[PDB]
Design a protein around this ligand. Structure first.
Ligand SMILES: O=C1N[C@H]2C=C[C@@H]1C2
Ligand SMILES: O=C1N[C@H]2C=C[C@@H]1C2
Lengths: 175, 175
């Protein structure tokens, strides 16, 4: 029996500023979480401790708010499963299918969504609810917008035997 | 005791044409494999069967050649560990550290290098020995060159507790 969990990664006040389409992405993430709550779909929050434990930057970016009962997993690396309670938290919920929203597309989101796939989960990436910042390397620029687009392209074709991957918008993903 | 293995992914005649800097990348991959052979470092080849088993497109792109004794792992998905003999092949070699060259940067290479990291390997990505093609999604273009650059940027900062990740060129990586 499929149980869906929404996994909201590093949507922290110190992470999202300057990200591509920041206000819109935060707005659609919020809408997604509301829809999950209305559907009785569990929401699990992941926070990156190196943002600065105890500082305002570590807390959820506005307008996101955690509800009573919703687990919060703290991590120190890009992979939300690495040395964390995430797997235990998910197993306790009987999770089989993760619906992923968060930041940043190319770091925590990238590394966590691929780890989840490797672990055997069905994964749905919410195409209009993740973001990152402009960057450059080796003398070429790559915008946040380009990284978001390329991420959605990558995920749309991801396949593992016996597993299901879906790319879907915040208001069409099945909850 | 660290044992290094060079892992050469999908450098196939049907995969590399049209890739960014194709001739140069193939040349540096070849040089890397030669250096590994001279150093007694094992080389493991991975081929993507969906390229077309039994067709010329499935074979190694020129000027690459497999030597006697070098394992060849066949796969059907982006992740070279998914339903393959790769883990068994690596375990038989006592591999602890994988040096990765191949194509395409954003598909087989991306998915395999991250899976290797998740499995607990030390991984070195060879910065000037992987490539992919131009693409576009959501109305924005992202070049092969941009994807290669962004991949190297990503890998340069990848961290897992107790594991080591290095980004290094084909002629400086330690063999
Ligand atoms: O994706 C990310 N989440 C935080 C840690 C690495 C980046 C900032
Ligand atoms: O990276 C890749 N290797 C082959 C399968 C998917 C792409 C072509």
């Amino acid at each position: 029996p499929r149980r869906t969990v929404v996994l909201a990664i590093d949507l922290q006040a110190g992470v999202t500023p300057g990200c591509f389409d920041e206000e819109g992405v935060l707005s659609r993430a919020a809408a997604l979480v509301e829809r999950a709550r209305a559907g009785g779909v569990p929401v699990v929050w992941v926070h990156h401790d190196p943002v600065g434990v105890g500082t305002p930057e570590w807390e959820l970016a506005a307008p996101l708010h955690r509800a009573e009962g919703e687990p919060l997993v703290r991590k120190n690396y890009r992979d939300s499963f690495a040395d964390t309670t995430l797997r235990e938290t998910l197993d306790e919920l009987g999770a089989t299918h993760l619906v992923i929203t968060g930041a940043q597309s190319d770091f925590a989101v990238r590394t966590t969504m691929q780890r989840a796939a490797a672990e055997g989960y069905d994964v749905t990436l919410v195409s209009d609810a993740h973001t990152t910042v402009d960057t450059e390397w080796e003398g070429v620029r790559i915008s946040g917008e380009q990284i978001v687009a390329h991420t959605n392209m990558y995920f749309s074709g991801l396949r593992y035997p016996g597993q299901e991957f879906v790319i879907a918008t915040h208001d069409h993903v099945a909850l």
